[model samples]
Target: MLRKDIGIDLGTANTLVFLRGKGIVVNEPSVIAIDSTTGEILKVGLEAKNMIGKTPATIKAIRPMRDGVIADYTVALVMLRYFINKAKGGMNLFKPRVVIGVPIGITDVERRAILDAGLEAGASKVFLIEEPMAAAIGSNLNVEEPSGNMVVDIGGGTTEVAVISLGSIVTWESIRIAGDEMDEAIVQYVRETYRVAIGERTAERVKIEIGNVFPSKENDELETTVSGIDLSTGLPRKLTLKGGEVREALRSVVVAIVESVRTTLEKTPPELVSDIIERGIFLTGGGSLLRGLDTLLQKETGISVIRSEEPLTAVAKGAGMVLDKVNILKKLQGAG
Candidate 1:
């Protein structure tokens, strides 16, 4: 395989790949479906995600990555290998140079797992970049300038905030509270209030359909008729859900995320603090798409908050930016 420089945003909910000249070439679910009877990979990404909770006993569909790290190492490696080969056009001839996005709070063992996984997944060179750093750069914030640039990246399983300057994070906050917790809140709310026990998928759908952080004059709230097994009756029942309810359900998680932002700002240097206030906070990832999140964070943090143009692609795009420019690449792990 003729290798090329590649940037990978290895997120918990999805994985996005960016090739040097080709832009982003792939975006898929971080799930794998395996056939237990034959020990074969039946599907990957969206196909695997679709099989969640709907698969037969012999077919196990699960997310290999959890909380922004590899939960199931073997499955994670297999999934990574599959994606790498696909991105490399099936030519296994040359191992590409890969730059992957990781969490700022990743432990030594977690960092090594990523490096080793990429090495075993056909990467000749693998560079690890923290999510907040990449998102700041990818969202068009200059990292080399002698000023504080902050980015809040709220993903499926974690929210990462960092004050960056001169290609490094000066102060940072990594919290395990994010979209997953919000979804779980919705699930619990329905379970306790409505006596309906729903799955992750259903809860996620409820969030999308009826989730809002702020209230407005006109309620554009969408009503979702959810069907789940009632705990008391042990029978399936349909319940209507609304945005106001979702707001209540997800309140604590959002508050914690905002608090993390505040804590990061509190520790920021005075010089960089002004820079952040002027430049405003940058938001990236799927969680940023929650209705009125930018505005709410702006109000809560008392600063201007702007969501990235393509919130979901910030990490991958940042990696691509580094792939094209060697300056940041030098700071990244193993790029030399």
Candidate 2:
């Protein structure tokens, strides 16, 4: 191969890279551990994620991306470069053309910021695609056909609801409510109700262990004990929390996502709505892995809900699929 065309799912919580002929070579958290005094990156990805709650005063762990876009431009550029270089296995004479998936409805300035980040980091050509479109492609939907394919992509910082047909999105909604917000809800619930202050990692662990928006036999008995600092006593304390509480904490976030889906459907054309009804709603992304989420969405929307085989990797794989076709790549490039 003469080139290493790459596709990046530059997600808020995680960054996944799809290298030509290499499948998904990098899947890591969108975190960087830097020395506060020296301003040097000590670690990136999983290693940096591990230091999230345990970092020293002189070290800072930051997520440069927020709500599916770059919040810290300089840091994000550094992280992007790290992924690109790692995916390419060091520098080469010919820089790779990069395709990145982004949220729907971002401003022109924001879009250019992302493109510039990639280009400055050494990508030869940077093309942007919508996350929902990429997720649909990764889930094996026939987007080029004239039929509606509904997708709900729940990622770290955002949830994307869309109705896709004929390779274009007829209607879509992007919300800044997803996994991170759910994690924060748990922290808020515990702090307010039990007077306990928990770290982000502990809160996230609680979510994975017992968080749920729907009740079923599998998750009904979900309960976990978490340890955190007691606000009143200033000492470490342990609390036994139940799934019901976690569900209650996540109620607002869950309702917002469901409402977005409903709104998208309401705005879609009747024919596409009918197509979505027959085809069912598809769920992809890490947040979709929450226990019984598919069941909840089905119950709320009155339609069949199906989770992708590999929900977390769907966007990345879908972006990779674009690299297989020159015309598709060109179409993506022309969009920006």
Q: Quick one: best TM-score, which candidate?
A: 2
**Model 2 RMSD in angstroms:** 1.5
Model 1 over residues 284-315: C-alpha lDDT tens digits? 88776778788889998899988888888889
> Model 1 off-target regions past 4 Å?
none
Clash number for each model:
2, 0
Give all TM-scores, in the order shown.
0.96, 0.97
Candidate 2: the clashing residue pairs are: none
How many Å off is the CA of 292 in candidate 2?
1.4
Which residue pairs overlap in candidate 1's backbone? 1-93, 1-94
What stretches of model 2 exceed 4 Å from their correct place? 333-336
Tens-place lDDT per residue, model 2, 222-334, is: 88988999999999999898888888899899999999999998999999989989999999998877778899999989999988888888888788787776655666742
Lowest lDDT 10-mer window, candidate 1? Answer: 215-224
